[PDB]
């Protein structure tokens, strides 16, 4: 499959928008994790490949995703990072799990079409 980056933007962006609409659950994911602001100086040791919603949006706007799985891989990276770093009892871990449930529902049909 050859992929049109504006046709992929139009197909994929509503799945990203689905994640942004979740409030409060998307709030920690809207900008890059800032370890200084959050007081978590080991974050970049543990999380080698950070990702967040703003980064995925800018990637999709600059035509960075040659094919849709690369996009799906970034969304999962963002989730896996938050699950790796955070305790299971934490607000952000539980928000991650909600976002992942939303994403799975949204992306399923879109990757079909
Ligand atoms: C994502 C992710 N992965 O690991 C952590 C830790 C986060 C993360 C990532 C971000 C998190 C956050 C947790 N909790 C909050 C709000 C509470 C807070 C805690 C300490 C200091 C200040 C606030 N935010 C901050 C959310 N703000 C909202 C407004 O825009 C900037 C980020």
Curated annotation (Swiss-Prot):
Residues 42-88 are annotated as: Interaction with histone. It is found in: Cytoplasm; Nucleus. Residues 80-98 are annotated as: Interaction with ASF1A. Changing residue 93 to C: In RSTS1; mild form; impairs binding to ASF1A and acetylated histone H3. It comes from the Eukaryota. Changing residue 97 to I: Impairs interaction with ASF1A. It is linked to Chromosomal aberrations involving CREBBP may be a cause of acute myeloid leukemias. Translocation t(8;16)(p11;p13) with KAT6A; translocation t(11;16)(q23;p13.3) with KMT2A/MLL1; translocation t(10;16)(q22;p13) with KAT6B. KAT6A-CREBBP may induce leukemia by inhibiting RUNX1-mediated transcription. Rubinstein-Taybi syndrome 1: A disorder characterized by craniofacial abnormalities, postnatal growth deficiency, broad thumbs, broad big toes, intellectual disability and a propensity for development of malignancies. Acetylates histones, giving a specific tag for transcriptional activation. Mediates acetylation of histone H3 at 'Lys-18' and 'Lys-27' (H3K18ac and H3K27ac, respectively). Also acetylates non-histone proteins, like DDX21, FBL, IRF2, MAFG, NCOA3, POLR1E/PAF53 and FOXO1. Binds specifically to phosphorylated CREB and enhances its transcriptional activity toward cAMP-responsive genes. Acts as a coactivator of ALX1. Acts as a circadian transcriptional coactivator which enhances the activity of the circadian transcriptional activators: NPAS2-BMAL1 and CLOCK-BMAL1 heterodimers. Found in a complex containing NCOA2; NCOA3; IKKA; IKKB and IKBKG. Probably part of a complex with HIF1A and EP300. Interacts with GATA1; the interaction results in acetylation and enhancement of transcriptional activity of GATA1. Interacts with MAF and ZCCHC12. Interacts with DAXX; the interaction is dependent on CBP sumoylation and results in suppression of the transcriptional activity via recruitment of HDAC2 to DAXX. Interacts with phosphorylated CREB1. Interacts with CITED4 (C-terminal region). Interacts (via the TAZ-type 1 domain) with HIF1A. The KIX domain mediates binding to HIV-1 Tat. This is CREB-binding protein.
């Amino acid at each position: 499959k050859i992929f049109k980056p504006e046709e992929l933007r139009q197909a994929l962006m509503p799945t990203l928008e689905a994640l942004y609409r979740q409030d409060p659950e998307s709030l920690p994911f809207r900008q890059p994790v800032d370890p200084q602001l959050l007081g978590i100086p080991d974050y970049f040791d543990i999380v080698k490949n950070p990702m967040d919603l703003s980064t995925i949006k800018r990637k999709l706007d600059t035509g960075q995703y040659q094919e849709p799985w690369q996009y799906v891989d970034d969304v999962w990276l963002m989730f896996n990072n938050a699950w790796l770093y955070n305790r299971k009892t934490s607000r952000v871990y539980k928000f991650c799990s909600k976002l992942a449930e939303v994403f799975e529902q949204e992306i399923d049909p879109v990757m079909q079409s």
